[PDB]
A paper describes a structure:
In this study, we present cryo-ET structures of full-length LRRK2 bound to microtubules in the inactive, autoinhibited conformation. From dataset (2) (LRRK2I2020T with MLi-2 on pre-formed microtubules), we performed focused refinement from the map including both the microtubule and LRRK2 and obtained a 7.8 Å map of LRRK2 only, which showed the highest LRRK2 resolution after subtomogram analysis. Our model of full-length LRRK2 on microtubules is similar to the published cryo-EM models of in-solution, autoinhibited full-length LRRK212–14, with the LRR domain blocking the kinase’s active site. As was the case with the structures of in-solution LRRK2, the ARM domain is flexible in our map. In agreement with those structures and the proposal that the N-terminal repeats constrain conformational changes in LRRK2, the kinase in our full-length LRRK2 adopted an inactive, open conformation in the presence of the type-I inhibitor MLi-2. Similar to the structure of LRRK2RCKW on microtubules, our model showed two pseudo two-fold symmetry axes, one centered at the COR:COR interface between two LRRK2s in a dimer, and a WD40:WD40 interface between neighboring dimers. We resolved these clashes by shifting the N-terminal ARM/ANK domains of each LRRK2 away from its own WD40 domain. This suggests that a novel WD40:ARM interaction is involved in stabilizing the oligomerization of autoinhibited full-length LRRK2 on microtubules. The distribution of these angles in our samples peaked at around 90° (θ angle), leading to ring-like structures around the microtubule, in contrast to the right-handed helices with helical angles around 33° observed with the active-like forms of LRRK219,22. Instead, the most frequently observed species were individual dimers and short oligomers consisting of 2–6 LRRK2 dimers. In contrast, our in vitro reconstituted microtubule-bound filaments of autoinhibited LRRK2 revealed a stabilized N-terminal half (ARM/ANK/LRR domains) covering the kinase’s active site.
Author numbering: 543 to 577, 584 to 612, 624 to 854, 981 to 1457, 1463 to 1630, 1642 to 1659, 1668 to 1720, 1726 to 1909, ...
Amino acid sequence: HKLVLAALNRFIGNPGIQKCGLKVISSIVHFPDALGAMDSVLHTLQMYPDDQEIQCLGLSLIGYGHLLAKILVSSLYRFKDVAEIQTKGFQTILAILKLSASFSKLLVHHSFDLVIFHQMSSNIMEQKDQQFLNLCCKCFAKVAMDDYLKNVMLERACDQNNSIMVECLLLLGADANQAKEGSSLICQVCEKESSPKLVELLLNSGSREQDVRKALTISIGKGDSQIISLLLRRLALDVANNSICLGGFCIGKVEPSWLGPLFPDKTSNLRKQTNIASTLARMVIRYQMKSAVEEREYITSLDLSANELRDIDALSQKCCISVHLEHLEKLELHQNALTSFPQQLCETLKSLTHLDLHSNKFTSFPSYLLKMSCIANLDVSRNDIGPSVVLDPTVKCPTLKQFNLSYNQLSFVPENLTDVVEKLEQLILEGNKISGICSPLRLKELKILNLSKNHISSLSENFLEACPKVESFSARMNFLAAMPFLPPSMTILKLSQNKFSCIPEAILNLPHLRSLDMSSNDIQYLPGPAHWKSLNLRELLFSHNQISILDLSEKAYLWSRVEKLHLSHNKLKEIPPEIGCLENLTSLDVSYNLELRSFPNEMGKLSKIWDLPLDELHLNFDFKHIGCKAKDIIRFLQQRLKKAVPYNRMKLMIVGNTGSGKTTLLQQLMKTKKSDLGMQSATVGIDVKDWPIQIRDKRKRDLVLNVWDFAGREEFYSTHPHFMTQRALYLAVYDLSKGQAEVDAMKPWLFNIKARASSSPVILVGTHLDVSKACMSKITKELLNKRGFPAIRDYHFVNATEESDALAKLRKTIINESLNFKIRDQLVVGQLIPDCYVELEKIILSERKNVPIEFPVIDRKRLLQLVRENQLQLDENELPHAVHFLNESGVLLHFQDPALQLSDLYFVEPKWLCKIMAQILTVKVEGCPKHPKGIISRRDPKNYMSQYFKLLEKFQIALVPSSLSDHRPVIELPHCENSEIIIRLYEMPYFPMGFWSRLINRLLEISPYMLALRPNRMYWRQGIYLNWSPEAYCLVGSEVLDNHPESFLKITVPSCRKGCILLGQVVDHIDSLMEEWFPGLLEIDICGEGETLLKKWALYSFNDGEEHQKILLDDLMKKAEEGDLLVNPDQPRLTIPISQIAPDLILADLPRNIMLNNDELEFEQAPEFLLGDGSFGSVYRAAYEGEEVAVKIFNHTSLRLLRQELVVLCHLHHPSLISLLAAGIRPRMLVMELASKGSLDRLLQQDKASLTRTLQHRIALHVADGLRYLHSAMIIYRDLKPHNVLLFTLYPNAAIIAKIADYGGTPGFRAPEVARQQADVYSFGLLLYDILTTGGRIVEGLKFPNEFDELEIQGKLPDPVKEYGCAPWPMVEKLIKQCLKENPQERPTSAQVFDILNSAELVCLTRRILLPKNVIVECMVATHHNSRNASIWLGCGHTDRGQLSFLDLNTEGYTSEEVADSRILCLALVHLPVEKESWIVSGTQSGTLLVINTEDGKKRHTLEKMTDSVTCLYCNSFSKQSKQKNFLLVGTADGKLAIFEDKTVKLKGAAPLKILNIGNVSTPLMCLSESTNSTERNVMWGGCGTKIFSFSNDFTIQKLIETRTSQLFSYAAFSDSNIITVVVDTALYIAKQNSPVVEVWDKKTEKLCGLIDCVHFLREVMVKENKESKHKMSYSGRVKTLCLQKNTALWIGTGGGHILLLDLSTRRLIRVIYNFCNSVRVMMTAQLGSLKNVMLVLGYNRKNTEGTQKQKEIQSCLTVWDINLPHEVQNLEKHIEVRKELAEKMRRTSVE
Ligand SMILES: C[C@@H]1CN(c2cc(-c3n[nH]c4ccc(OC5(C)CC5)cc34)ncn2)C[C@H](C)O1
Ligand SMILES: Nc1nc2c(ncn2[C@@H]2O[C@H](COP(=O)(O)OP(=O)(O)O)[C@@H](O)[C@H]2O)c(=O)[nH]1
């Protein structure tokens, strides 16, 4: 019982008894392992806390419900640091967790954090219980198992400021951008007044930039000077570029105490005290993996434009930066609201040369801005400068160049220019209010004046009489009358919008003038080219004048260079033929004249014309179906210059109805005697026949009209519209037996004749007198004549079987009607064509005398062979029109239609192919009607069955829409309550025949409605009724309402949100058809009234449901109700939104947020407010509730086009796309993002100082991404060029830099056009080329612009670095070539080019130099003393004897010169500060140490001949003699340090100061190094044999560290071999011959503190991409050389074809950059041409071209990397990830 009694007695013993009871139970707990005390021993703790002597015991006994934990920490917290009782506690926790894992989560539940934080931070480090502390890292490692536990405790770890532990947690993961995304870590960390080290650690690791900006706003709220300067240093600083990009931020005020540390400071050097955190992180990681596995120096200018600086005086003082400003050389203050530029500032900075501050609110040009030392381009161009701007004459500033004064409120030209600004060039004064006549203006160097938009009366006669270099005087929009003796030097003169009456003779005589724009003048006579006295006229812009003649008869060749001639809006009469001499004409413009009417054939010689607007003028020809475009018009005018002839050979379409005198009247018109077939049957198809008529009269014109006796029976009634062209003479026939009743039923036919060919004649012909009613002439005169039916021109009553004069009269009438057609007096029947067409027609007809009957088609190859067989003058560009024209004449049908596919096949003999297309429509099936009537599958010879229905369903006969269930099946809509449906009518007098056949076939195949779920559809002849659901369905019905002889087209669609989509997408397909095939219907006949024959109604009802009637409304009149949005009757209390009865016209269908209310508008449209022109309209700027927002206004255009654009540009959200904000119906225009820094063309035109390669690459990458998305959206751009790319910010590493405008071409932007997909790739190639070029492609657009598609694969293209001089930039120079394949199949995809652009290597490298063929070189030395242009001196080893091998870099010219009798090993540079020379030294195989001068390759003197092979040379920094001093080291193959002095090199056989024999004959000296710092007096370290050594100015071995005696043998010879390399840093990194591992010694302890293996980094990559590497287990690959950067990383040069980056501080591998060489032999650092700190890499590329001959072809591929690589490989890495998250977050807005 003792256990039971002891426990219960200790329980009841509330006073005193516990102190002993606990000792009794702690002794007894070991022996029986007893069994119900835990609860009571728990209870007693609460029952009396606070007694240490029992607390320790209780904790000791807990280890032998959750309230347990609640007492534990509350104990350890109540005894934080009283004694080592925490030991017993943490032992208890460690015991409990290892058996109950989840209890750990319970511990952190209560208070664990409070006490563990305290213990790990109560200064426990270097206190004696370091082993107890090891148990506690062991605790934490299991504590931080759950990542969420890391994040939330991290949250708590920043609440209380604790730098060491927050750093430790960051090293353990625990991302710092997860808390709230609106109030995430940095926000409260700057709110709670934390420490700079706490904020810096948060910023350095993952911290989203938006949160940083929010925290910047917060920390601006308070006054903090060490947290602000750390937020800016991560938000705005480009250290690579020396910048401050503080642009977008809304900083309330700038104070130098913030930017203080942003400027570079040489004193900045900080120790390593946070190593505690790294050590603790290492211990935690160790315990975690154990628990896991088996348990000068001045910056550039400043960001300043849009900051609304109401004052800039803050910088005028003598503050911290008042000495860095003195070398600014560019200052931008435009668009702020400044005033009165501070006088102290404008003399503080004495090197400013682009000061521009416009759009500010100045009111007085300071006139003390001009006392700066070297200023130019002074620009104040939108301020409110006072009425006069006189310059004070006490300033003599000559350096000013471009003194802009645009758009001020001036009243005079500035007064004292001539005495102040002498060298002034571009004095601009436009937009002012200059009124009075100007000054004599004695400026000696004006080069571009300007006076536009002033109010000038006239110019003084001595205005330009003293400015002998003016070039571009341009006074637009003034009130100007004459010109005052312009100096003979003007080149460009622009004088538009003035008030002239004739070109003043002061212009007709300028001896060098080049362009003259005088548009919008009211002038009368344009003097002939014999009045212009100038040999170089290029542009002559004269639009909007009143010009009568275009005098060119006098002397035309004197204007042979003219390239632009704009004469629009003039009273011209005709173009004189002398215009044919201006061969260099490029852009003629004679539009809007309304009185020109004819083009002379002479213009066909002006082949350079690429545009020729034809707006509002009528020509002979110009008929759209045959009308040419651009050069095609010139080709037409040139072929018409050759020879145009009368063609005289037309058509007669006979038309009947189911029976009449048609065939028996055609067989009587043709007088056909044969009667071969004694019994003709009903007509099949159209049966084309032809019959010549040599009219035996004075007119010998033997006219041949072809008769097409159309099908009578109604069954053929769908194809006939195809054979009714506009050019014809139709008959029609009665069968007068059913007189006055058949004549009624003939009405549809005439109607169709009025539908297709409005201006075609018709001839009625009675066909029966033998069969009996002849009063039919009544009704044809009574009803049929002139009411909506075509221009009947006769009627006859022949027998059409035999014996009468009436037939002769019918013949005469037909002949005389044919010879009298002449529509619009154009006379079709004899019009002129090139004889080539007639020849082609003749040869084709003669092949109607030779073809296969089974397949009358001709292949295009056969046609191009038959043109060769004859002597036709046609090329591959003539046939595309030739065959079309011959199609127009009924010779052969060929299909070029975009709706189908272009036919390689040619349908000569149409007479049987029309016969073939109708066979299917007559074959029936009286077998088993297994399918509903009309639908059928493939059921019928040699491959012809394939082409038959490869034509017929291309002909949309497939399921035959004809003979298809005329009676409609009964259909009921889910909802028919008069208010959930939308209904639209199409009342028309009679359906077109193939209307339904082609209507149900256009709606049918559009399956992806509201995209890919197909609907169920049950479609009879005249209806569809698709359905997805009761939420989406459509019934395009066909009913006739009672007492309505017309025929309607009822469409019903639910008024739901998606139903409006159905409506719109169906009305588009029903309207576009009507204007594509039936232009007669939707042709408003102003003659009579606007019937339009197509009265598209709209049905609306006020009474929601049970309206008892649907109220009509004509759609046009409803469209007139667009000034509002709601319709309402004469009774105005109730109304229906137009948004409820026609949601398709209505704006709301795309995301509803697009709506412009016309309320909070803010706008202007003057010629400053547009931003550019493009496609179908232009774009302007305005504001609304916004500030700046762009508006795309439209021309002329239509709400067809806009509906396309609305949908297609919407529903597409992408970072590279220019998203639109709103649309405006009333204002007929759209709204877009304002592109802040301009367009790419502008950027190229101006800003070439500021295009970094990074930046160019960013733009290209952004663009590559947009184009990729556009192909994700499966579509062409078709508009890619500098004019179309928009730039937002000029900050290189931003998130949005470039975007792409208007969507699916130019001489400056050509391709081999598909119609003359993969094409946009090529267009991108052009843009990319120019971006690489920076303005080379169309600067030539001022010069030789036709040449832009002439050298198409052939131009400056072969070497554009060479052809433009731009900075070399490989990989992408290969990318454009490799992209730019002429064949579209050969081009890579846009996704592929985007992926290749997303490659840090494409951004990081600039050149290599493949040395001459088979040269082996193994040593090289750079030159930094002449840092202007440097040459890299190489050795050789292709020869066993020594050649030196010079190699320059700016010329890349290799030279060879044998200088030694034995192969060289190494060289070095010893430059002497005296005598200004750099002796170059070379050590060799024989020991013959050679020294040769820099410039002289003859003053050579080998020094003492060494004993063994010299392995090394080196030049040190040893100034130990109180002066500048240097030495030289000769590493030989034995260790003998033959040291010398910097100057003693000249004397033959130099004297070694201290000959230090170090190594042995078997231990070869093999590497030397200097130290990393200079504070250790440059202790020198050199490897020797296998033991590294060191020395100093003493030149005595200071250490004999041995490496072979290593205690970590994984292999021996990797350390048991001769040393190869040594580098001196905080530690030592060493490698040996063929050692694939590097050894890391320490200088003090001399211990192998590191062992870093190379193939330890080769595995990770090879495993996927090298499968043959599984056979290469005995791997080649080892450290062939070392090269260490200053403090960032270390570059391992492999013996293989690889290179390794090592971040020596924290993470081992940054990147391996392979596949660029095969053996990295040499590596070193250097400086070149102010591009200091480059790293040269001499690698090998062996070619086994003759490897079978045991020989390899060697190319020493010397490359030059930019040493800044280890940053960009980790910084650009990051930059992708940024844009990847943003790629996804943006696509969330597409979801919702
Ligand atoms: C420098 C000036 C130039 N600017 C622009 C803006 C734009 C522009 N923005 N948004 C657009 C949307 C469409 C668009 O279609 C083009 C390419 C057809 C002209 C242009 C812009 N295009 C040139 N320049 C903006 C102002 C503030 O700055
Ligand atoms: N007796 C008689 N028959 C005629 C006359 N004109 C046409 N027909 C008949 O019309 C038929 C000619 O075919 P047509 O009607 O032109 O062919 P369809 O239009 O394809 O049916 C023959 O059967 C003729 O006998 C006429 O004046 N007298």
